[PDB]
Design an enzyme around this catalytic site. Structure first.
Site, PDB file in Angstrom:
ATOM      1  N   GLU A   1     -15.543  -2.277   6.653  1.00  0.00           N
ATOM      2  CA  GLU A   1     -14.329  -1.749   6.704  1.00  0.00           C
ATOM      3  C   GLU A   1     -13.816  -0.626   5.743  1.00  0.00           C
ATOM      4  O   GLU A   1     -13.111  -0.163   6.407  1.00  0.00           O
ATOM      5  CB  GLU A   1     -13.274  -3.413   7.496  1.00  0.00           C
ATOM      6  CG  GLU A   1     -13.926  -3.971   7.869  1.00  0.00           C
ATOM      7  CD  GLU A   1     -14.299  -3.268   9.140  1.00  0.00           C
ATOM      8  OE1 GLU A   1     -13.720  -2.266   9.965  1.00  0.00           O
ATOM      9  OE2 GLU A   1     -15.293  -3.347   9.809  1.00  0.00           O
TER      10      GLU A   1
ATOM     11  N   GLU B   1       1.030  -0.712  -0.010  1.00  0.00           N
ATOM     12  CA  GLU B   1      -0.002  -0.445   0.085  1.00  0.00           C
ATOM     13  C   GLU B   1       0.803   1.162   0.283  1.00  0.00           C
ATOM     14  O   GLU B   1       1.953   1.557   0.379  1.00  0.00           O
ATOM     15  CB  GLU B   1      -1.027   0.380   0.885  1.00  0.00           C
ATOM     16  CG  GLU B   1      -1.911   1.088   1.125  1.00  0.00           C
ATOM     17  CD  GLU B   1      -3.191   0.985   2.077  1.00  0.00           C
ATOM     18  OE1 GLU B   1      -4.035   0.082   2.293  1.00  0.00           O
ATOM     19  OE2 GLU B   1      -2.871   1.566   3.744  1.00  0.00           O
TER      20      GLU B   1
HETATM   21  C1  LIG Z   1      -2.910  -4.799   1.511  1.00  0.00           C
HETATM   22  C2  LIG Z   1      -3.124  -5.069   2.753  1.00  0.00           C
HETATM   23  C3  LIG Z   1      -3.720  -5.813   3.327  1.00  0.00           C
HETATM   24  C4  LIG Z   1      -3.371  -6.815   3.913  1.00  0.00           C
HETATM   25  O1  LIG Z   1      -2.191  -6.557   4.180  1.00  0.00           O
HETATM   26  C5  LIG Z   1      -1.898  -6.205   5.477  1.00  0.00           C
HETATM   27  C6  LIG Z   1      -2.604  -6.114   6.282  1.00  0.00           C
HETATM   28  C7  LIG Z   1      -2.004  -5.490   7.693  1.00  0.00           C
HETATM   29  C8  LIG Z   1      -1.276  -6.539   7.675  1.00  0.00           C
HETATM   30  C9  LIG Z   1      -0.494  -7.020   7.338  1.00  0.00           C
HETATM   31  C10 LIG Z   1       0.651  -8.163   7.238  1.00  0.00           C
HETATM   32  O2  LIG Z   1       1.303  -8.630   6.484  1.00  0.00           O
HETATM   33  O3  LIG Z   1       1.238  -7.317   8.638  1.00  0.00           O
HETATM   34  C11 LIG Z   1      -1.324  -7.268   5.559  1.00  0.00           C
HETATM   35  O4  LIG Z   1      -0.264  -7.709   4.871  1.00  0.00           O
HETATM   36  C12 LIG Z   1      -3.999  -7.759   3.914  1.00  0.00           C
HETATM   37  O5  LIG Z   1      -3.728  -8.667   4.205  1.00  0.00           O
HETATM   38  O6  LIG Z   1      -5.286  -7.591   4.039  1.00  0.00           O
END
Ligand SMILES: CC/C=C(\Oc1cccc(C(=O)O)c1O)C(=O)O
Length: 420
Positions: free
Chosen positions: A272, A238
């Site tokens: 969300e 992101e």
């Molecule tokens: C695009 C981001 C969305 C997510 O990625 C994350 C969100 C929160 C923590 C992490 C992590 O690696 O700790 C993660 O990869 C998801 O997995 O839903």
């Protein structure tokens, strides 16, 4: 600035990582490699370093350490020091800790003395690698010769990876999730991202692991670094913030992970994402020109749902205030942000440091590109580790959340090349 045409059959990620491995090893220097929209920028050598800690700001140039006390917003203190670096060089690079975003929520007092907030440096040399060419900026004879030596040897073959066990729970992630669920049920907050560290029992080769993982990941941004005793690599899922020279501020929050049709129709994922888009929009508004705040490509599919929040940077504001307004990302913190961040201090291994913070590229023209640090590997001292989390809501189950961390870790776990 001299240019070299890119050799045929060579992937720019592989060449940029090899240049970071061979060139920097020969001259024994620190570096940061940043991938941003088809350009792999290798920031080689430390011309000057800005160290922002909870209790002090230091500027180190040619062995001379200048120390300063600072008050107020950390973004103002970081911005002032970084703007000075940019009077001498076109670009500055570094990382911003999760801890940099706690001041905004009235949590500065919880930070221990000497807590790192940001490390930003101006490089001595820059090598930009793309599909088209290799561009050299302020490259000395030693660097030019070492680059020429690399182009002649070609890229090394990536060795087979070495496996790692992620099944243990030494930090009690499951117990910590159960506590978060109880706090959510008691209406203390709506969401919190809790994480766990996974120790890698062997030394890894960072540029080679970067190359392997990059062949199996399509990130928003990526990085490979060796800076101030820290080795790190990651596939940023992101963009926290992007500020252009014209003043356009962008933020791209993401949610959820043919059908496909399920993701676009899931009520729990839509709520969300909408809450996050609203949060990002409220934050961008505080730093934007009145009425410039808009959502472009709302809730569009990108294996994930995402939206683009755009605005125009108000003349009374700046790039650091934009970063600070959006920090930490909702993706890795919580809803409401203030209660989520505070819960992380109590229910997560703190300080987080690089994890859920950002890796940054800044430009003299007022540019800023900040990638969210997730799906990253770290090496500090004799310790090598991975770190992954999961969003905790009322409905969350500890055993399910643990399996989710295993899945998030699988972005790196099959691609760890041991140091030879
Ligand atoms: C695009 C981001 C969305 C997510 O990625 C994350 C969100 C929160 C923590 C992490 C992590 O690696 O700790 C993660 O990869 C998801 O997995 O839903």
């Amino acid at each position: 600035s001299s240019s070299i045409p890119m050799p045929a059959g060579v992937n720019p990620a592989d060449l940029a990582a090899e240049l970071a491995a061979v060139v920097t090893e020969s001259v024994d220097e620190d570096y940061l490699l940043y991938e941003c929209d088809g350009q792999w920028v290798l920031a080689a050598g430390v011309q000057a370093m800005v160290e922002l800690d909870s209790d002090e700001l230091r500027v180190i140039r040619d062995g001379v350490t200048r120390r300063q006390q600072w008050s107020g917003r950390p973004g103002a203190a970081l911005g002032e020091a970084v703007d000075r670096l940019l009077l001498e060089t076109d670009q500055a690079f570094g990382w911003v800790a999760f801890e940099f975003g706690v001041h905004r929520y009235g949590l500065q007092q919880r930070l221990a003395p000497h807590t790192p907030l940001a490390r930003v440096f101006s490089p001595r040399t820059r090598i930009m690698v793309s599909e088209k060419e290799i561009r050299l900026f302020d490259a000395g004879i030693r660097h030019r010769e070492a680059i020429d030596r690399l182009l002649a040897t070609g890229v090394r073959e990536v060795p087979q990876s070495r496996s790692v066990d992620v099944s243990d729970d030494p930090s009690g992630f499951r117990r910590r999730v159960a506590v978060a669920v109880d706090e959510i049920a008691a209406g203390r907050y709506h969401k919190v991202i809790l994480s766990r560290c996974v120790e890698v029992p062997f030394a890894i080769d960072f540029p080679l692991t970067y190359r392997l993982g990059r062949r199996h990941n399509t990130p928003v941004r990526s990085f490979l670094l060796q800076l101030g005793g820290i080795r790190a690599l990651g596939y940023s899922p992101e963009l926290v913030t992007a500020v252009r020279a014209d003043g356009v501020v962008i933020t791209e929050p993401l949610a959820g992970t043919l059908a496909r049709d399920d993701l676009e129709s899931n009520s729990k994922e839509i709520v969300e994402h909408a809450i996050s888009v609203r949060s990002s929009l409220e934050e961008i508004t505080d730093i934007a020109e009145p009425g410039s705040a808009a959502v472009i490509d709302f809730m569009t599919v990108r294996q994930h749902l995402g939206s683009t929040i755009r605005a125009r940077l108000d003349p009374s504001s700046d790039r650091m205030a934009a970063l600070e307004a959006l920090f930490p990302a909702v993706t890795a913190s919580g809803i409401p942000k203030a209660a989520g961040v505070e819960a992380i201090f109590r229910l997560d291994e703190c300080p987080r440091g690089l994890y859920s913070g950002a890796v940054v590229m800044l430009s003299a023209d007022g540019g800023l590109d900040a990638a969210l640090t997730l799906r990253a590997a770290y090496q500090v001292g004799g310790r090598t580790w991975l770190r992954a989390g999961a969003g905790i809501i009322e409905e969350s189950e500890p055993e399910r959340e643990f399996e989710e961390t295993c899945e998030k870790l699988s972005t790196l776990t099959p691609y760890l090349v041991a140091r030879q």
